């Protein structure tokens, strides 16, 4: 519980999102140069973006 509380406090602290990834409800977007291969495994839900590097 202590570790979880510390993690949640870190999440709720101040700052910004410094990554180019932002959530959308349409689909799960995968960067071009990510090691993930889930898009090849599945047939629906995941979309790979070529311009996202």
């Amino acid at each position: 519980n202590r570790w979880l509380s510390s993690f949640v406090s870190q999440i709720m602290s101040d700052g910004v999102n410094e990554t180019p990834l932002w959530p959308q409800e349409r689909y799960v977007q995968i960067a071009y140069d990510s090691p993930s291969v889930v898009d090849g495994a599945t047939q629906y839900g995941y979309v790979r973006k070529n311009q996202l590097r």
Partner: protein, 42 residues
């Protein structure tokens, strides 16, 4: 000037499809000199 990449590479130096086409219109330029006269800079 060899190259080698792991997993993936957005650019391939020794690959195919690259273009080498020097032309007069394109030329090649940098910043060689600028106007920094003392009177004109003030």
């Amino acid at each position: 000037m060899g190259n080698a990449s792991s997993i993936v590479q957005t650019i391939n130096v020794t690959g195919d499809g690259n273009v080498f086409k020097p032309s007069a219109e394109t030329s090649s330029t940098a910043v060689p000199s600028l106007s920094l006269s003392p009177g004109m800079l003030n």
